[PDB]
Amino acid sequence: GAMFQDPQERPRKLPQLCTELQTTIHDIILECVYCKQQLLRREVYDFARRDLCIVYRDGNPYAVCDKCLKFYSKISEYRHYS
Ligand SMILES: [Zn+2]
């Protein structure tokens, strides 16, 4: 449910991404990069309520779901590009 293409270069931060989508966290479709399940809006809040970074699976914006959040909370904005 999340396939983001140019010129939507995509950020790494959730509130910023919401800007790209011209919307807010309260609306944004962000899924698990890993589980492909759309995050519960509460979990989507977790992301910006803390200091996590968005993870693009291949090149689409996904958040890190409930399960993955505890796993990948270590990653707080990484420069893994290309
Ligand atoms: Zn997940």
Q: Experimental technique used?
A: NMR
Q: Are 24 and 31 in contact (CB under 8 A)?
A: no
Q: Rounded distance, CA 40 to CA 32, Å?
A: 10
Q: Rounded distance, CA 44 to CA 27, Å?
A: 10
Burial class (CB in 10 A: 0-12, 13-18, 19+), 74: exposed
Residue entry with tokens 């399960």? 67
What is the DSSP secondary-structure string of the chain? -----TT----SSHHHHHHHTTS-TTT---EETTT-PBPPHHHHHHHHHTT---EEETTEEEE--HHHHHHHTT-SS-----
Range of the domain at 52: 1-82
Cα–ligand 1 centroid distance for 46 (angstroms): 13
Q: Are 73 and 66 in contact (CB under 8 A)?
A: no
The residues, any chain, with a CB within 8 Å of residue 12's CB and separated by 6 or more, are 53, 54, 77, 78
* 3, two tokens: 């396939």
> Total domain count for the chain?
1
Question: In CATH, what number is assigned to the domain containing residue 74?
Answer: 3.30.240.40
Cα–ligand 1 centroid distance for 6 (angstroms): 25
Cα–ligand 1 centroid distance for 64 (angstroms): 6
Cα–ligand 1 centroid distance for 20 (angstroms): 23
Cα–ligand 1 centroid distance for 56 (angstroms): 12
Q: Rounded distance, CA 68 to CA 32, Å?
A: 8
36: left (phi over 0), alpha (psi -120 to 50) or beta: left
Cα–ligand 1 centroid distance for 70 (angstroms): 10
